[PDB]
Amino acid sequence: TKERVERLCKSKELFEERLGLEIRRIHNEQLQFIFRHIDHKDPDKPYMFTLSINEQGDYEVTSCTPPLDCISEFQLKVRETNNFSAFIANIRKAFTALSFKQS
């Protein structure tokens, strides 16, 4: 089982580095999604949002820093489609667009 646990650690680390996405557990059973590698001129600059699961099992965005004009609609869409992958990918794309506008 040592092989399996090792591989799980390795996978986490490779994903974090390659995707530029760190996932952090915080209080009240929430996860922070920290995107880096968004701003081509400041690859360590973070763009983040916080996710919870409500009492009915639904995804709930509890914070977004910097704010995104589209993330509330993305929450609606993930509740409707249950497509977590597309939800996260759309958020990442939105942060890239924002960084471009921030310049």
């Binding site: 996978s11 490779l14 994903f15 530029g20 996405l21 992958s85 597309a86 759309n90 990442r92």
Partner: protein, 60 residues
């Protein structure tokens, strides 16, 4: 739990034997699975991340 969320999002399974500059694995998802195999040595972090995220569909 983290490693699993990364798969849920990306649908990538990595090759764990190769060295770190060799980005190698298979990308699954809704379309037919395709291999990933490239040397990331002479590529910037942001361009590599944009490349890997380009594999993940946004349609919904």
């Amino acid at each position: 739990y983290v490693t699993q969320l990364y798969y849920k999002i990306s649908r990538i399974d990595w090759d764990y034997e190769v060295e770190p500059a060799r980005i190698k694995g298979i990308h699954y998802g809704p379309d037919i699975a395709q291999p990933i195999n490239m040397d990331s040595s002479h590529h910037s972090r942001c361009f590599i991340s944009d490349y890997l995220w380009s594999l993940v569909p946004t349609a919904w």
